[PDB]
Amino acid sequence: EAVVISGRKLAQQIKQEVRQEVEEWVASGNKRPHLSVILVGENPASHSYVLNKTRAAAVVGINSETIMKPASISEEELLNLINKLNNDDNVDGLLVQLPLPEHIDERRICNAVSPDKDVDGFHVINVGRMCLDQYSMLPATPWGVWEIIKRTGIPTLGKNVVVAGRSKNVGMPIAMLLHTDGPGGDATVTISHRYTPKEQLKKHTILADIVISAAGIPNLITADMIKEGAAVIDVGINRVPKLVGDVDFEGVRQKAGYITPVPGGVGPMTVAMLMKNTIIAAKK
Amino acid sequence: EAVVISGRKLAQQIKQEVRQEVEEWVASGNKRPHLSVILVGENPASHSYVLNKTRAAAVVGINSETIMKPASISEEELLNLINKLNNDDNVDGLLVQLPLPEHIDERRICNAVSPDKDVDGFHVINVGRMCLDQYSMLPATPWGVWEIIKRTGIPTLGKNVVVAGRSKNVGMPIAMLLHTDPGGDATVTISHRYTPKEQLKKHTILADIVISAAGIPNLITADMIKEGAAVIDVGINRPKLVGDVDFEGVRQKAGYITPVPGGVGPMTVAMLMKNTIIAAKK
Ligand SMILES: Cc1cc(Nc2nc3c(c(=O)n(Cc4cc5c(Cl)cccc5[nH]4)c(=O)n3C)n2C)nc(CCC(=O)O)n1
Ligand SMILES: Cc1cc(Nc2nc3c(c(=O)n(Cc4cc5c(Cl)cccc5[nH]4)c(=O)n3C)n2C)nc(CCC(=O)O)n1
Ligand SMILES: Nc1ncnc(O)c1NC(=O)Nc1ccc(C(=O)N[C@@H](CCC(=O)O)C(=O)O)cc1
Ligand SMILES: Nc1ncnc(O)c1NC(=O)Nc1ccc(C(=O)N[C@@H](CCC(=O)O)C(=O)O)cc1
């Protein structure tokens, strides 16, 4: 039987460290960290995820505010709001929850957030810093995946990692961290493409010690794709009427040596790492 | 028998294209393009390589200088020289040859070159732009790998690509371009040097394209290649110079192959000429 990694437990431990770190930082006389989140429109997933983030902020000692704007906002008002928060010395972290309405250019918005406040690491400069090991702040979901691996003690050096991504924004940053020299796993990394044949993907997963699925299709990762003892980390978000990941949990539970559940796996880790990035931002 | 791709011939053709575009940009009454290359110290590979760059600038009509400085130069001195060239309206392209001496922070140096003059694409925002498909200027060697594949006509949509990386700086830009929606749309593997030949082989035999940038003689042999696959040799091994590939062994099985020397190396220099006309036109 596979070990089932509790994302909740690891996040809870990570959040406890941030509280300790935030409390000491305030005990030295500094301003309490503040995180601002801009939420546009009404994606139910987005509101749910943003509520998780501000809940986690309060219980770790980080002040927070969510600014909700209707979807009919223009790109110019969103830029004015971002520019205001960039200049607010009480605001340490600023993130924009994605996706944005189609009439707004996401890349323009993410590049308008000040790079010192970019707790998501979506600004072009922070993407470059991550590539070049200059960083201060790492994208929360890739860093969350890495902490699951590292804190569980799963070996990466020289190992075979496969990342099944829906987009390059998602699979490449995960791959980059595991490929980086030891954050960084010294691992061989395969990044499967969109619409890649499942059996073509299979010939890569069969070899993998660590399969990381972030494609958003149900049952992409079944037992006939895993060698025994392989760690399987589920990043998929799927509605099928309930939430599931990319892995057939009960099936792969037999074959695999490690498996993360959805919910309760990567999700809580994403939120927890965002807390780490916010204290980092408040410290400069 | 594997068809051998002459990187030299392909690169000389690209330089002819750059030349006409430079000579037309000048005929139209703009300043002739100027490339400045900063060389620190005495690494012989660095000098040979920079020689090939200024020789290519001459052929294609771009003015150029190599500014050679002793290895004892301080970081502050180098930054001051870079700042001067950044502000010199005659300079269009500016690169610092690497490696630099250990008392100079190479990341600080590359991030001090103006991003508009950064014809190597080593400035952090240019690296970020390349990741996010916002760029106008690709690093020369990965872009050269891509032109080879492209002008040869090797298909990449859905194919398996394996890059044998030596550092993250070398294999990952190559993988970035090949995995991207210049696109390429390929399943990409970047192997770390801590994965043995035995496990790397499990990946290379599935690969329609194998790109070796590991700097390890005879890393790629015919057993690791599936029949008909393209093999791009990026490696440099130094009394002769060879690439990572057993050229003779795998010319029997590959579908395409590039030689070392005369393969990726001339493409690197050619693509740098393209980045420099791009920079000159703002
Ligand atoms: C609705 C939505 C939006 C969304 N946007 C999104 N995810 C991102 C990014 C992003 O810019 N970067 C930085 C980066 C490094 C990087 C590198 Cl190193 C190479 C190449 C590209 C790179 N981008 C990321 O790492 N991630 C994870 N964006 C814009 N992601 C999801 C799915 C996962 C989730 O739920 O967050 N959903
Ligand atoms: C001694 C030496 C130094 C050296 N320096 C070196 N090569 C580099 C870089 C670099 O920053 N980038 C941009 C990049 C994109 C990028 C992405 Cl997208 C992801 C991750 C990292 C990334 N870096 C590169 O693409 N390359 C190829 N550097 C600093 N390169 C060689 C081999 C070249 C040769 O000898 O031909 N040798
Ligand atoms: N879109 C973005 N824009 C800007 N920056 C970002 O980081 C994102 N990305 C997210 O915010 N991604 C995210 C996804 C899921 C959770 C999460 O909490 N999942 C739970 C509950 C499941 C549910 O309620 O449906 C679980 O799996 O346990 C948290 C964050
Ligand atoms: N280090 C760097 N710092 C800053 N920007 C860079 O781009 C680099 N990287 C290079 O400059 N890499 C490079 C490697 C080989 C050649 C080359 O000309 N190879 C020839 C002859 C081989 C020989 O003469 O030894 C061939 O293979 O045929 C040219 C450039």
Residue numbers in the entry:
A (entry chain B): 36 to 217, 222 to 279, 287 to 330
B (entry chain A): 36 to 216, 222 to 278, 287 to 330
Q: How did the manuscript describe this experimental structure?
A:
MTHFD2, a one-carbon metabolism enzyme, is localized in the mitochondria and plays an important role in nucleic acid biosynthesis, amino acid metabolism, and protein synthesis. It is a NAD-dependent enzyme and functions as both 5,10-methylenetetrahydrofolate (CH2-THF) dehydrogenase and 5,10-methenyltetrahydrofolate (CH+-THF) cyclohydrolase, converting CH2-THF to 10-formyl-THF (CHO-THF). MTHFD2 forms a homodimer and each monomer consists of the N-lobe and C-lobe connected by two long α helices. The MTHFD2 gene is upregulated in various cancers but very low or undetectable in normal proliferating cells, and therefore a potential target for cancer treatment.
Compound 9 and 15 show similar activities, despite having different chemical structures and, in particular, different tail moieties: whereas 15 bears a bulky glutamic moiety, 9 carries a relatively small propanoic moiety. To compare the interactions of these two compounds with MTHFD2, the structure of MTHFD2 in complex with 9 was solved to 2.25 Å (the ternary structure is hereafter referred to as MTHFD2/9/21) and compared with the MTHFD2/15/21 structure previously obtained. The propanoic acid group of 9 occupied a similar position to the γ-carboxyl group of glutamic acid in 15. However, the α-carboxyl group of 15 is absent in 9 and thus loses the hydrogen interaction network with Ser81, Gln132, and Leu133. Also, the core of 9 was observed to be shifted away from helix D, resulting in the loss of a hydrogen bond with Arg142. In addition, instead of direct interactions with Glu141 of MTHFD2 as observed with 15, 9 was found to interact with Glu141 through a water molecule. 9 and 15 also have different head moieties: whereas, 15 bears a phenyl-based head, 9 has an indole moiety consisting of two fused rings. The indole moiety was found to extend further into the dimer interface compared to the phenyl-based head, leading to the formation of stronger shape complementarity interactions with MTHFD2 and the additional hydrophobic interactions with Lys203 and Met207. Most importantly, the nitrogen atom on the indole moiety of 9 was hydrogen bonded with the side chain of Asn204, which is absent in the structure of 15 bound to MTHFD2. The more extensive shape complementarity interactions and the additional hydrogen-bond interaction around the head group of 9 compensate for the losses of hydrogen-bond networks observed in the tail group of 15, resulting in the comparable activity of these two inhibitors.
